[PDB]
Each structure stands twice: as C-alpha cells, then as structure tokens.
C-alpha cells in the first residue's frame, strides 16, 4: 500500500532448532540479543548470515523470556522462567556477568529501563515490583496484592509507570508506585470473553515526533485490537482493528512507524500464516510482510531503522526496509528532511551538491517533498487549510499557495502542481516572474470537459466515494489518477478534461509516465512491475476495439523507478541492491547500488545514498551521490580506450548520440587530436568547441596547447601551475583575471619577481574592495579601497560604516573642485554636521550651499559670518522673518536667543 | 497591562464561590441559596438550579467535566451531573465552607466546622475525618497526593489522600491571621492530564517531602501573602499587603497570580508575589477571582452580588535597532536576541517592565519607579555581555521612549525631553501637536538625529545637540508609523488610514503609495527596497515596480539582507525574501546594473546564469563578467575577454559583438543576420561552413 518498501534479506538458524521466545536489538552499538528455550541466550552482530560476532551465554535454567538493553550504559539485562536475573557487560570483547539476582518466588514477566538509562523497573507475575538503579542497588519494592501484572513501561520523563494487568487491564502509577488511575481501553468496544495485552510500546521522542502532539504510546491486545495514545490518559486515542492474532508491537527508532507482529488464519485453510503489519502513528496501514515458520515469537528494529529482526521458529529473519523519506532532487541540490531531538520543526536541508553547500530551513508540519526542474514543493499543514510552499534549489520560498484539501498525493510538472486527497484533486499552474485560470479543483467521480477556468468549488471535495484515489502522476501532457478499484483515469493538461477511463487487474502502489506520455509504468500493491501502453489499439477476444494494452513485461520487488528525461524508451528500475536499466522491454546488465534513483538524462543515472546521509545529516560527503553510465556510454568509453580515438568514431557514426560526440571530443582534445575533436564538436553542433579547437590549432607551443586545453575541463589550478612552469606568470595572472580570483591575482603580483603594474595593483585592490562591498562587508571593502585609491566608494563605505572621522579624513584629502566633495558635503548634511559640510562646500568652491547649510542647521552665526557675500544681508531679512514667526508663536526667549546667535545684540 | 470588561451581571444575593467547566463553556456561581449557570461568552444566565434549602457557601467542579459538588448552610452537599441533575445528595455534620475535587482520581473533599468528608467516585461511604479547627479552605497538591487545609486558627496543615495529617505550619500570631484561601501552583506535568477528551439518591455515613516539588500560595488576614513547600519550609519572605486578601488564585499556566479582597479589586502578581497590575476595581469586597481555563480571561464575584467577566490583553513591548531584538518575557524580564548569531540573553528585573529601547551598544528599560541603562562591554558586534551602566531612581510619565549614545529621550504627551545618563536634563522641545511616533535615525555620538511624527501629520527631524526642530514634511493625516531608507534620502510613512506613503526627503516629494499597510521597514542595506504588513499579507516592494504579496499575520519590525524580521503574537519569525523575483523585475526593464544588486544578496546559479546572459546580450560586459564569475563559467568569460580585447584596439560595432554572443549561444540564424547587417557576411559564411551547414552557408558569398 502507500508507504515504504521491505523484503526478507537474511536468515540465521539456531542449533538443534531451539525455539526463540524473545529478541531485542541494541541501538548505540548494534548487538542483537536473542533468548530461547533450555537456557539459550546468544549475542549476534551484523557487519558489511555473515555476522562478525556470535557468543552464546550460559547461567539460565529455563526459557529466557526477558531480554532487554540499556542503551546509555554498555549493559544487557536478562531473566528466565526460573527467576535468575543477570546483568552482563561487554568486557575485552566478551559479554561477562556483572551482577546476579534471584527473588526465589515468581516468573519475571517484564522489564523496562527508564528513558535516561539510570533505573530499571522489573515486574513479577504474583504482584511484586522492583525499581533498581544502574548501580544495581534496589530503590523501592511494592507488592500489588490483588492482580497479576504481565507488562510495564515508563513515561518519556520517567515520572509515570504503566503497569499492565494480565486480565487485559492497565493501571497508571507514579514513579514511587502510588496508584493514580485505571487507563481507558476504548479499542475494546464490542468484545466478548477474556482479553490480554499483547504489547505496549511508548516512543520517548528522542529523534523528535512526526508532529507536535502526535500519538506516542501504542497498546495492543491478543484479539488484534490496537490503540495509540498522545499521553497516558488520552481518552480519544487512535483506534485500530488489525484483523490478526497479535504477539507483540515495536516503534522504529524515529517513532515514525509502528510494526505489529502476529499471525492470521490463512484464506483457504485451518492453518495460520505469520505476518508483520506496519502502521503510521495515525493508524493508516503502510503494508504487510509474510514470514515462513511455525510461529513468530518476537520483533525488533535495528538502531538505524533499515532492518527489522523477526524471531520465528528457531530462526531470526531480517527484513530489509527502504524508508519512504521526505526527499527530492532539484537542479543539482538534494533536498532531505528529518525530525529533530530539540525542535518541533522538520530540519529541511537543501544540499547544493554542485558547489557543496548546505542551506537549512526549519519547516513546521511537513507532509511531503516533491521536485521538477529547479523548483521543489514542501507541502505542509497550515498552523482544513494546507500550504504548498513552492521553493527554489537553495531553499528560499517563492509562493506559498493555501489549499482547503489534504495534499495526500502530489505530482509536480514544469508548469503544474497537482495535489489530491482520497476523493478530489487540485491543479495549480506556476512560473517565476493571465493569472485567473491558474487554479482548479475536481472530484474523482466527476466528468469535467476541460473548458472551464472555474472558481474553486471546495464544497465538492467532501462528497463521499466508494473507490478513493491511491496514486497519481502527471507528464506535462496528461494527468493519470489511480483508484483503489484498479480503475485508472486519464485527464488532459494544461486544462483538465476526462479523456478515458481504463480498468486493470490491480491497485497501483506507484505510477510514472515516459516523456512522450504513451507508456505508463505501474507498480502493483504486491511490488510487481507492469507497462501499460495507453494509446495502443487492441482487438479484444470478443472482436471489440479496446484502447490501452498491458504489455508482456513483468518483474518483482520493484519499488523505485525513473523514465529517462530525454529518451521515450530508456527506463530504470530498482529491485534490491541492483538496478536493471531497460531499453524498450529489454533489460541491460544489472548495476550494483543501494541508493535511490536521483536523475536520468544524457545516458547517465545519478543515484543518492539517503541511508548514509541521514546517519549524520549535518556533515554529508561528496561520495553519498554516485553517477552511473548506461551500457551505450560505457561501451563507447571502452572503445575509445581499447580501439583508440581514430576508429572508435566508427561505432558512433554507426549508432550516434549527442552525449557520445562530446565524449569523443573531450577525449580527442586531451590527446591533442584537433582534427577529430573538430569533427566531434561539429557532429554535436558546439560552436564554442569548434572555435576552441581552431584557436588551439593556431598556437606554436605544445606546452601552451597543454596549458590551454587543461583549462577547458575546469582544471584552472593545473593550467596556472603549467603557466608558472612555462615562465608565463603573465598568463597565470591572465587566467586568474578571467576567473575573478582577485586574491590570487594580488598574491601572484606580490610574490612574483617582476615589478607589479601600478594600474593592475589598483585594479586588483578595487575588485577585492568591490567583492566585499557587494556582499555588504563595508569594513573589509575599506581595507582594499584605501590601497586601490577608490575615493568614490570609500565614501559610501565610511558612511554605511558610520565613521564620520573616516569620512572627514577622506573629504579633507581631496583637491578643490573635486567631483566627490558635493556628495560628501550632502552626507554631512543628512547626518546633521555643520562644520564638516561647511568645510566640504568651501573645498568644492560652492559657497551658497555652505550658507544654506548654516541656515538649515540653525547655525545663524556661521550663516552670517561668511562676510565675503551680498547674501549675508539678504539672509538677515530671512532671520528677521523667522524671528517674527517665533514671536507669532510668542516664543520671545527663543527670539532673544536667535538674535543673540545673529549677533543682533541691540535687539 | 490592560484589562477589558467583556460582560457583567448582578445576582439577587452575594456570590460565595465560582466554578468553570474545564473547556471554559459554562460558569457556575454559588449565589445566595441557589446555583446559577452562565455562558462565559456573553453572561446569559441559563438556569437557577434549585436543590439546596439555605446558603450555597461554595461550588467546585471535577477535571473530567462530568460532575460538580456544591455545599450549603443546610448541611447538604450535592453531586450534580453536567446534565444539571443532582444524582447523589450527601449531608455533613455542620455547614459547608469550601469543597475541592482531586486533579487525578476525582476523589472529593468537603470541609466544615470540624470535619472534612473524603470520598472516591460511587463508593458507598465517606471518610468524615476530624480537625482541630474551623476548616476554611482546601486545595489538592498538583499530583493529587495531598489535600492541604487552611484554618481560621492561622495554621495550614497537609493531609494525605487517605486523610492522615503529615505536616503543619503556624503563621506567627495564630488566630490573629485566619487563612481565607490557599492554592497549589498548577505548574507541573499533570496539567495536560484530562486535557484529552472527546466523549436523586443519598450517600451514607509519604516520605522525602523535601524532594516533592509543589508550592502553596497562602493568603492570610494578617494581611500578608507567602509561598510554602510541602516540607513546611517558607519560600523567601512574606509579601506584605494593605488589605484583607481573599481567593489567591492562578491562571492554567501557573506563572501569574490573581488576588482579590477588601481592597475591593482584583490585583495581579507574578508567581514570586511581585505586583504587576489591576484587573477591574469594584464597588464592594471581592470574595472570588477565578481565571478561565486555557485562556487569559478572568471572572470576579463581590459582596454586592456583581459578577464581572474580564479579558486581560497583555500588550507587546520591544525594540530592534539594526539586528538586536529586545523584548518583554514574563512581565519582568527582557530577552535580547542577536538576530544574525541567534544568541539570546535574559536580563531579570524585580518589577514590571513598561518600556524598552535599544541602539548600538546601549539598551534602556523603564520599570514603575526607575529607568535602567545597559551597556555592551566590548565594541565586538557579536557581543551580548550587557552590564548596567547607570540606574536613574526617578519616576516618569511617558508616551514613547528611545535611547542614543549618551542620552535617554523621553516623549511626554506633547513634549520631547533629552536626559543625560545620570538623569540631569540637557534640552527639551515642544511640538505644535501631540506626538504619535518617534525613531532614532543614527548620527555621531551626542548629535544623533531623531525622526518624529505628529497627530496633525507634520514630520520633523530633531538633532539632540540642537534647540530647533527641522520640518521634513507635512501630511493630510496623522503619522501611525515612520521609517528612513539606508542612505537617509527616502521616507516611508503609515498615514493612520491604513495606507503606506513613500517620500523623497531631500526634495520633499511623494514617490508612491500603497492602499493596505499597518507597519513598514526599509531594507537596512539594499536601498530602493522595502517591506510592509497589512490585512493578513506581507508585502515586499522594489524601486516603484509591482509588489510581492504572500499571506502572513504579525508585523514587520525590520528588514536586513535577505530576511524580514516579522513579529508573531509572542515571538520574532524571520521570513525570507524571494530575491529571484525582484531580480527578474529589474531584468524585464533591462536594468542589469540594478538586477545584480538583488542577485548579490543570494540567488541560485540558475538566476546568476539567466542574469549573466541577459547582461551579455544587453552588451553590459561589466555586469555579465561578474554575473558569470559567480557561476565561474570560463567559456563566456573568454568571449567577454575577446570583446573587451576588441573594444580595446578600436572596434565599436555592437552588431558584430551581439553576433558573437548569438554564435556562442547557438542562436545561429540570428547571429547570421547580425553578421550580415554589421557589414561582415563572410563571418556568417565561415560560421555555417564550420558547422558544415551547407544548405544555409551558400547564401553568404557576395
């Protein structure tokens, strides 16, 4: 169904077929521990069954029905049906015994360490309880006389204990054993006879939750009922009927999946088949895994969440599991997103793999990621409304469209976003820069014409359907929608009209279209591939003329796939750790690979190792993305190496491709075959390449042809070293000028033997000044502009830096009548400095503006003291008028002070 | 601090105690000899519940919201369903005083003159357990494990859930200081317990306490309030009063206290017992002050029978400067946040915080009875080590406050005062109308410019070293908000009709306006670009072009580089600008030299390449050179170096230069037309001959 994909990867079979009762897997160091009958304990460790350590452990007297791990400290705890409790430590590469204990009275039914690993709770069947420190010292012990426990957990903070009760009843205590309340078991509505707790598991939130206030605590019962709470007294939990006899339950390490282990009566037999069912925290069913054997006994996830160990009938199986990550690739950025220990947001990372940079964006309520070209959509829950955060390849949001439908399924296209609930789909047309017809919404049982740029009828979206949506896809030419009936609907784009309804023998788990939009690659709910040729005419066995043909192709365990962007019949498809690239229906040689199919164009498939990236998402490495070459490209690269550049061209003339002409061109350039390189650039129409071979074909020196051709690939450091070895420091600086490495330009000019050109040191400093000033680092720009004699931007820096002593010593340095003095004078006016502005307007020989500045800043003394001008008498009439206006305001003391500033001492 | 009367009613009689349904939908009041049921939205009284004979001295209501308990002078207690029927009557030894349900188990208590009557739901018996004294008031520990009782004898004593007595404290003076109410603080993990739900007969007849975390508010008629642990230890000191207090009480949050009494008001306090303000003052004694569940509303009951329902509004207090958001936390702390490094510092006062202001290296904070000046100890722009520089022990009245390098600036209601640090006044300015807005606009230390907006719509610049105020502009409506662009050449104004207006300051002329704005800021570095918020949108506008609109609620406080410091209803959010969008608005206009300034703040390599080739085809080789250096594409840098190496040595034919650009781009037919029209048909012959395109090459011999 919708979700992740998983398959049985391994087995381990135990000597004498000793039945396992329990298994659990360490997460800080990765040991498995498994407990079986007749005192069997074993510790096992996987490495890359071919396991790297396998130690049996001895001391138990019966079936080892409790095995449990301390993560925070290097300790395994175990007990059997004879009540010997043992804590083991890994010492000199061996699990030795550290402490031994026996109450001598009852079966130990269960245990749990607390969320900090400082305490263990141990619960007996008869009614006792112990809490003990990691020191081994006992803290307290009740005896809950009246009822038999059978289960335990802590709460996330370790303040509360859940004890189960064997009669299918749950009681909540504080961490001192004071009875608080009975828990409400609301999933047990409409039930008959006895109930038993099959399991309880509480995700303590350590990787962060799927959402704030998400369900955290799962409970399940032997009748197959399950109940997922937000906290210990959530009285409105998620309710599930699994339809099977459950034996146990486990969250994955990230708390994003619940696995439920059990068995179901087989559909045609009085015989049971073992199954694991996987659930979301919200109770949607992700999938079912069968396992062979008499009974599944127990269940546990690997610390990475990429394997799950299944203890079954004296065997441990390991299901590999391929997470349905919130991820996508856009324009040579990988987008990956993860929940955090210390935030409610998803930490979305835009890793620019072309430059190797991380841009990090914390997003609330992330539902999905999707990509097409340079843009991605982070679909999210709005703080019902949802928002499609259309975003670019470095992670800055462009247009958050709000929609009133749940974006369960999303398809993206170079013009369109399509989002769909189980019942209706919304299409939004987008670009970066009429607007009205660019959004529409449609119900899945509707029959739209295509013609109407109508308003969003969100009221139609809640009309109930018998066959909901389960997958969608779109191609820039059609939208294909898959129903749970196995009906598939074809709609047009850019406008949406219903073209045809098809029907098929399967539900679609995934759908994807070739670029020509005529072949649909359908993956069934069972993990089986098929191709459907959408346009193909068929004569039916009745003679009726059918359209749409199921092609003869079939393959199994398919879960990731990619039609090539350029070619209509190249396709790629994962099975396990193998990729089987196709041409038409015919598979190539399989390629060894773990990672997801990232991009497919120009005869190359990019692959990304998300499973490695997400182990340490803050320090990704170049190697976590790998490039594959499909067979036509590897054959052509092999011919060029074996048959040589001359005659390898015959295979490409026999079977040409624009990628192969470039390969022959770059090969011929590197071996200096300018004739064949010219023909290869001609055959792929590269006029930049044709000019480049001609330019090389005019040069006199082979050493210089090497230095120039080394440049073509982007090996600029090697070209520079070549020019320095050639005694062409001038061409070394010339290459750095062209590349803009002005620090290197200046470093070569400083370190060279020759007298560096003054105008070139000036150019070098001024370009480094500009480099920092354009990045708003004004204090850095000053360091270069003061060397590079750039007074006209040194002023802009001293002003933005707010250094009026700097800006003074700049303006005092200039010649009289210099073009910059009237702008520095205006800077001193905008900031309110009269003497500096007067100094600048006097060096500019611009005296009327000095007087006007003295007037504006009310320096009426300095305004009138410029006695060289007739204007002094004229402004005496303005001073009188201003004083008369202060006297109309009746401000006689200010008119006295103004006349004192005027030196009008008589008045 | 602000409080608004949402609704009021008056009963026929005095009002003795108050209960809320846990979802806040209904209020129940013990008025005289009946229970009254009210809607909290508007105070409609739904029903007088009739069951009792005499004075209903109290009511309380269980955490599951199914059942409430009410106690009478007629000795009865009645358990009412939320269907408002009294399914289980009970009858105590004497008149009832206070009743209180347990937070966890729904076990009830019911106090009387000597005896307190515990029982757990629908068991057949009640523990009528004995007391030394009149049992005035009762409150369960936050984890449900102890019932604490206050006595008229001036003792508080602590009883376990079974009724055994474990701890005592006596107020020094005994029966001089009756305990009229006490309350355990709600602040522990259990407050969300029962916060997840979507669902007449008669009833007959503890160690390591210092490690238990609970805290008890005690209000005594010795006219003092004090806080106590379950260990019996007093926390700090007695917070003295000048009234007989009643009903010491808390919000759901556990951080703010309500305190009613013979002061005839509802006073508001911190959890440390420092005063913060006044909810509505009253005609008569206040007996009860109950905070609404999940929310900032309050309800009050008085001796005269008035019920009053108040909303507390808790206004926002902050200042930003360039990149240091300082804001009020609790109501007593400033949190100062460096917005680039995301560092926070907490400065704790010991009073209310009323006003904050900030400027380079200077922070100022106003309390009720002093003003604090704080200083960064280093010139390092990443520093956060604020020390108190000076502390002015003087009371002030103000509308607005700002701080400069050496001065505090106070706006009194039509008058601007400059005060030195150390409180001595320097200068003062009197406006022609009431001041609506002020901002500091920078300057040299001690001559800083201030930007001032008046109710008459006049806008002024004032220099702190000058006695005269300089008119920048006048407008047809009041200044609501006000900002200056990075160079100080341009002004943005909000006109108190919810529009933004934008002006040239050097020429005093309007550039443009926008019809929906509430707050506005210029980009602190990139001039000709600004942001505003209004009507549920954020709005980014560049250089008179169209405006980018997206949904937001909250207000623009500032704008730096690629980030807009929008403020949500409690915290700063830092929205990011789509730089790619204003960049393409410059490129539609062929403004390449300008487009690079939007790009240079951060855009994709696709944006840089699309800028670079637009500059290259626009023959802006100085922009294109830099736009390609960002991508580091040597192919087109070699072409640009060729065209510059032909502009040097005296070529000038632009059509020949565009032909080369179109040749490298593979725009061959357009390159060929340019090679023809530039006068060089032989270059078009060479281009198609070299491409071996002989069906086109034949044209160009001539």
Swiss-Prot record, chain A:
Cysteine disulfide partners in this protein: none
Subunit structure: Component of the IFT complex A (IFT-A) complex. IFT-A complex is divided into a core subcomplex composed of IFT122:IFT140:WDR19 which is associated with TULP3 and a peripheral subcomplex composed of IFT43:WDR35:TTC21B. Interacts directy with IFT122, ITF43 and TTC21B. Interacts with IFT43. Interacts with CFAP61.
Designated name of the protein: WD repeat-containing protein 35
Keyword Cytoplasm: yes
Involvement in disease: Cranioectodermal dysplasia 2: A disorder characterized by craniofacial, skeletal and ectodermal abnormalities. Clinical features include short stature, dolichocephaly, craniosynostosis, narrow thorax with pectus excavatum, short limbs, brachydactyly, joint laxity, narrow palpebral fissures, telecanthus with hypertelorism, low-set simple ears, everted lower lip, and short neck. Teeth abnormalities include widely spaced, hypoplastic and fused teeth.
Induction: By TNF.
Subcellular localization, as worded in the UniProt entry: Cytoplasm, Cytoskeleton, Microtubule organizing center, Centrosome; Cytoplasm, Cytoskeleton, Cilium axoneme; Cytoplasm, Cytoskeleton, Cilium basal body
Function summary: As a component of the IFT complex A (IFT-A), a complex required for retrograde ciliary transport and entry into cilia of G protein-coupled receptors (GPCRs), it is involved in ciliogenesis and ciliary protein trafficking. May promote CASP3 activation and TNF-stimulated apoptosis.
Keyword Cytoplasm appears in the UniProt entry: yes
GO cellular component assignments: axoneme; centrosome; ciliary basal body; ciliary tip; cilium; intraciliary transport particle A
Protein keywords: Cell projection, Ciliopathy, Cilium, Cilium biogenesis/degradation, Cytoplasm, Cytoskeleton, Disease variant, Ectodermal dysplasia, Repeat, WD repeat
BP terms from Gene Ontology: cellular response to leukemia inhibitory factor; cilium assembly; intraciliary retrograde transport; intraciliary transport; protein localization to cilium
Curated annotation (Swiss-Prot), chain B:
Domain of life of the source: Eukaryota
Substitution effect: residue 7 to C: In CED1; perturbed ciliary protein trafficking; no effect on interaction with ITF43:WDR35; fail to assemble IFT-A complex at the cilia base; no effect on ciliogenesis
Keywords annotated in UniProt: Cell projection, Ciliopathy, Cilium, Cilium biogenesis/degradation, Cytoplasm, Cytoskeleton, Developmental protein, Disease variant, Ectodermal dysplasia, Repeat, WD repeat
WD repeat spans: 10-50, 51-91, 93-129, 131-169, 240-279, 281-321, 474-513
GO cellular component: ciliary basal body; ciliary tip; cilium; cytosol; intraciliary transport particle A; membrane; non-motile cilium; nuclear membrane
Gene Ontology terms describing biological process: camera-type eye morphogenesis; cilium assembly; embryonic body morphogenesis; embryonic forelimb morphogenesis; embryonic heart tube development; embryonic heart tube left/right pattern formation; establishment of protein localization to organelle; intracellular signal transduction
Annotated effect of mutating residue 674 to P: In CED1; uncertain significance
Coiled coil residues, start to end: none
Effect of residue 353 to L: In CED1; uncertain significance
Tissue/organ expression: Expressed in many tissues. Predominant expression in testis and pituitary.
Mutation effect (residue 534 to V): In CED1; decreased ciliogenesis; perturbed ciliary protein trafficking; strongly decreases interaction with ITF43:WDR35; fail to assemble IFT-A complex at the cilia base
Keyword Ubl conjugation: no
Domain topic, free-text comment: Forms the trimeric core subcomplex IFT122:IFT140:WDR19 via the C-terminal region, whereas it interacts with IFT43:WDR35 via the N-terminal region containing the WD repeats.
Subunit structure, as described in the record: Component of the IFT complex A (IFT-A) complex. IFT-A complex is divided into a core subcomplex composed of IFT122:IFT140:WDR19 which is associated with TULP3 and a peripheral subcomplex composed of IFT43:WDR35:TTC21B. Interacts with IFT43:WDR35; the interaction connects the 2 IFT-A subcomplexes. Interacts with IFTAP; the interaction associates IFTAP with IFT-A complex.
Illness the protein is tied to: Cranioectodermal dysplasia 1: A disorder characterized by craniofacial, skeletal and ectodermal abnormalities. Clinical features include dolichocephaly (with or without sagittal suture synostosis), scaphocephaly, short stature, limb shortening, short ribs, narrow chest, brachydactyly, renal failure and hepatic fibrosis, small and abnormally shaped teeth, sparse hair, skin laxity and abnormal nails.
Function of the protein: As a component of the IFT complex A (IFT-A), a complex required for retrograde ciliary transport and entry into cilia of G protein-coupled receptors (GPCRs), it is required in ciliogenesis and ciliary protein trafficking. Involved in cilia formation during neuronal patterning. Acts as a negative regulator of Shh signaling. Required to recruit TULP3 to primary cilia.
Protein name: Intraflagellar transport protein 122 homolog
Originating gene: IFT122
């Amino acid at each position: 169904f919708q979700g992740m994909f998983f398959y049985l990867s391994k087995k381990i079979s135990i000597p004498n077929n000793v039945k396992l009762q329990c298994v659990s897997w360490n997460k800080e160091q990765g040991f498995i521990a498994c407990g079986g009958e007749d005192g069997l304990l074993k510790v096992l460790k996987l490495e890359t069954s071919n396991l790297s350590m396998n130690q049996t452990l001895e001391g138990h007297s019966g079936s080892v029905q409790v095995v449990t791990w301390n993560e925070q400290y290097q300790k395994l705890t175990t007990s059997d049906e004879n009540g010997l409790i043992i804590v083991w430590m890994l010492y000199k590469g061996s699990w030795i015994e550290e402490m031994i204990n026996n109450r001598n009275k009852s079966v130990v039914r269960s245990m749990s360490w607390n969320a900090d690993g400082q305490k263990i709770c141990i619960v007996y069947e008869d009614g006792a309880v112990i809490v003990g420190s990691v020191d081994g010292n006992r803290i307290w012990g009740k005896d809950l006389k009246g009822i038999q426990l059978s289960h335990v957990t802590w709460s996330a903070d370790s303040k509360v204990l859940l004890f189960g009760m064997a009669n299918g009843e749950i009681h909540i205590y504080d961490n001192q054993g004071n009875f608080m309340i009975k828990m409400k078991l609301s999933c047990l509505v409409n039930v008959t006879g006895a109930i038993s707790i099959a399991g309880i598991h509480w995700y303590h939130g350590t990787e962060g939750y799927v959402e704030p206030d998400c369900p955290c605590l799962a409970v399940c019962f032997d009748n197959g009922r399950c109940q997922i709470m937000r906290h210990e007294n959530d009285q409105n939990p998620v309710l599930i009927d699994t339809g099977m006899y459950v034996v146990g339950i486990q969250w994955n390490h990230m708390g994003s999946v619940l696995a439920v282990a059990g068995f179901q009566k087989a559909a045609m037999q009085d015989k049971d088949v073992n199954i694991v069912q996987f659930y979301t925290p919200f109770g949607e069913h992700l999938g079912t895994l069968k396992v062979p054997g008499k009974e599944i006994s127990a269940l546990s996830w690997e610390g990475g969440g990429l394997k799950i160990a299944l203890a079954v009938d004296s065997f441990i199986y390991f299901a590999n599991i391929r997470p349905n990550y919130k991820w996508g690739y856009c324009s040579n950025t990988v987008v990956y997103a993860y929940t955090r220990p210390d935030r409610p947001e998803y930490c979305v990372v835009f890793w620019d793999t072309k430059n190797n940079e991380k841009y990090v964006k914390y997003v609330k309520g992330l539902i999905s990621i999707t990509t097409c070209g340079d843009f991605c959509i982070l679909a999210t829950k709005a703080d019902a409304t949802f928002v499609l955060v259309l975003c670019n390849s470095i992670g800055t949001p462009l247009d958050p469209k709000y929609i009133d439908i749940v974006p369960l399924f999303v398809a993206m296209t170079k013009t369109h976003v399509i989002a769909a609930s189980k019942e209706a789909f919304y299409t939004w047309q987008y670009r970066v820069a009429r607007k009205e017809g660019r959004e529409r919404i449609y119900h899945v049982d509707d029959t739209p014409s295509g013609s109407m740029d109508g308003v969003l009828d969100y009221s139609k979206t809640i009309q109930g359907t018998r066959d909901p949506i389960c997958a969608i896809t779109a191609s820039d030419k059609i939208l294909i929608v898959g129903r749970e009936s196995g009906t598939i609907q074809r709609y047009s784009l850019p406008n949406v009209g219903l073209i045809q309804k098809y029907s098929l023998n399967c539900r679609a788990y995934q759908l994807s279209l070739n670029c020509n939009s005529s072949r649909l690659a359908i993956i069934d709910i069972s993990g089986v591939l098929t191709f459907f040729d959408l346009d193909a005419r068929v004569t039916d066995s009745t003679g009726q003329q059918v359209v749409g043909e199921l092609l003869k192709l079939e393959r199994r365990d398919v879960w990731d796939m990619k039609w090539a962007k350029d070619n209509p019949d190249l396709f790629a498809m994962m099975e396990k750790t193998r990729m089987y690239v196709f041409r038409n229906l015919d598979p190539e040689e399989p390629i060894q690979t773990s990672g997801y199919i990232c991009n497919f164009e120009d005869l190359e498939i990019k692959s990304v190792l998300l499973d490695e990236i997400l182990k340490d998402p803050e320090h990704p490495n170049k190697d976590y993305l790998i490039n594959f070459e499909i067979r036509s490209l590897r054959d052509s690269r092999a011919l060029i190496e074996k048959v040589g550049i001359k005659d390898a061209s015959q295979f490409i003339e026999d079977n040409p491709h624009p990628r192969l002409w470039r390969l022959l061109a770059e090969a011929a350039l590197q071996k200096l075959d300018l004739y064949t390189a010219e023909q290869a650039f001609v055959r792929c129409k590269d006029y930049q390449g044709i000019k480049f071979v001609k330019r090389l074909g005019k040069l006199l020196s082979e050493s210089m042809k090497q230095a120039e051709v080394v440049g073509y690939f982007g090996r600029f450091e090697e070209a520079e070293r070549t020019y320095l070895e050639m005694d062409r420091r001038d061409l070394a600086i010339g290459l750095r000028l062209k590349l803009g490495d002005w620090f290197r330009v200046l470093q070569l000019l400083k370190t060279g033997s020759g007298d560096a050109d003054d105008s070139l040191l000036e150019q070098a400093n001024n370009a480094i000044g500009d480099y920092f000033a354009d990045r708003q680092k004004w204090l850095n720009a000053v360091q270069y502009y003061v060397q590079g004699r750039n007074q006209e931007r040194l002023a802009e820096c001293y002003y933005m830096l707010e250094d009026y002593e700097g800006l003074e010593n700049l303006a005092i340095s200039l010649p009289e009548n210099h073009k910059l003095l009237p702008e520095i004078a205006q800077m001193f006016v905008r900031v309110g400095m009269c003497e500096q502005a007067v100094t600048a307007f006097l060096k500019c020989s611009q005296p009327k503006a000095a007087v006007d500045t003295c007037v504006h800043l009310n320096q009426w003394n300095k305004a009138v003291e410029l006695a060289k001008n007739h204007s002094m008498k004229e402004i005496g009439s303005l001073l009188a008028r201003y004083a008369s206006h202060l006297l109309e305001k009746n401000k006689t003391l200010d008119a006295i002070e103004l006349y004192r500033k005027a030196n009008y001492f008589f008045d | 601090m602000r409080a608004v009367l949402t609704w009021r009613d008056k009963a026929e009689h005095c009002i003795n105690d108050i209960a809320f349904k846990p979802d806040g939908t209904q209020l129940i009041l013990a008025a005289g000899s009946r229970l009254l049921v009210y809607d909290t939205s508007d105070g409609t009284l739904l029903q007088p519940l009739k069951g009792h004979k005499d004075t209903v001295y109290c009511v309380a209501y269980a955490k599951d919201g199914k059942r409430f308990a009410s106690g009478s002078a007629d000795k009865s207690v009645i358990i009412w369903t939320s269907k408002l029927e009294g399914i289980l009557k009970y009858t105590h030894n004497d008149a009832i005083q206070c009743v209180s349900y347990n937070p966890i188990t729904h076990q009830l208590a019911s106090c009387s003159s000597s005896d307190f009557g515990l029982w757990s739901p629908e068991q057949k018996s009640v523990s009528k357990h004995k007391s030394s004294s009149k049992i005035i008031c009762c409150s369960w520990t936050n984890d449900g494990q102890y019932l604490a009782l206050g006595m008229f004898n001036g003792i508080i004593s602590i009883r376990n859930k079974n009724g055994e007595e474990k701890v005592k404290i006596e107020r020094p003076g005994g029966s001089l200081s009756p305990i009229w109410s006490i309350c355990w603080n709600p602040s522990s993990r259990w407050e969300s317990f029962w916060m997840n739900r979507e669902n007449x007969x008669x009833x007959x007849x503890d160690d390591n306490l210092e490690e238990r975390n609970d805290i008890l508010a005690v209000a005594d008629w010795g006219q003092k309030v004090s806080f106590y642990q379950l260990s019996g230890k007093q926390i700090g000191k007695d917070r003295a009063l000048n009234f007989d207090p009643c009903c010491i009480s808390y919000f759901t949050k556990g951080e703010y206290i309500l305190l009613g009494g013979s002061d005839k008001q509802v006073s508001l306090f911190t959890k440390d017992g420092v005063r913060l303000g006044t909810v509505g003052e009253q005609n008569s004694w206040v007996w009860t002050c109950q905070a609404k569940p999940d929310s900032n509303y309050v309800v009050v009951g008085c001796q005269d029978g008035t019920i009053s329902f108040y909303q507390l509004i808790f206004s926002t207090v902050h200042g930003l400067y360039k990149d240091r958001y300082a804001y009020r936390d609790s109501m007593t702390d400033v949190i100062v946040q460096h917005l680039i490094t995301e560092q926070k510092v907490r400065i704790k006062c010991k009073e209310l915080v009323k006003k904050i202001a900030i400027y380079r290296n200077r922070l100022a904070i106003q309390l009720p009875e002093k003003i604090l000046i704080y200083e960064l100890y280093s010139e390092d722009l990443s520093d956060m080590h604020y020390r108190v520089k000076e502390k002015i022990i003087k009371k002030f009245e103000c509308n607005l406050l700002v701080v400069c390098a050496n001065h505090i600036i106070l706006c009194q209601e039509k008058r601007l005062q400059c005060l030195s640090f150390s409180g001595v006044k320097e200068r003062e300015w009197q406006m022609e109308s009431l001041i609506r807005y002020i901002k500091v606009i920078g300057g040299p230390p001690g001559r800083e410019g201030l930007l001032v907006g008046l109710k008459n719509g006049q806008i002024l610049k004032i220099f702190v070293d000058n006695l005269f105020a300089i008119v920048l502009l006048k407008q047809a409506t009041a200044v609501r908000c006000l900002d200056m662009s990075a160079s100080r050449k341009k002004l943005a104004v909000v006109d108190e009709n919810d529009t933004c207006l934008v002006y040239d300051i050097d020429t005093k002329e309007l550039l443009f306006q926008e019809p929906n704005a509430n707050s506005v800021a210029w980009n602190t570095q990139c001039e000709d670009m600004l942001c505003f918020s209004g009507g549920g949108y954020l709005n980014i506008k560049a250089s008179t072009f169209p405006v980018h609109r997206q949904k937001l609620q909250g207000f623009v406080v500032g704008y730096n580089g690629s980030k807009i410091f929008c403020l949500h209803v409690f915290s700063i959010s830092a929205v990011e600008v789509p730089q790619s969008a204003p960049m393409y608005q410059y490129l539609d206009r062929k403004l390449f030299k300008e487009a690079y300034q939007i790009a240079c703040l951060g855009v994709t390599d696709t944006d840089w390449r699309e800028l670079a080739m637009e500059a290259l085809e626009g023959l802006d080789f100085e922009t294109a050179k830099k736009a390609f250096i960002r991508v580091q594409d040597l192919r087109y840098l070699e072409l640009i170096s060729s065209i510059e190496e032909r502009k040097k040595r005296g070529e000038t034919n632009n059509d020949l230069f565009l032909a080369d650009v179109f040749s490298y781009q593979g725009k061959f037919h357009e390159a060929a037309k340019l090679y023809k029209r530039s006068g060089h048909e032989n270059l078009a012959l060479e281009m198609y001959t070299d491409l071996c395109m002989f069906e086109y090459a034949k044209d160009f011999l001539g």
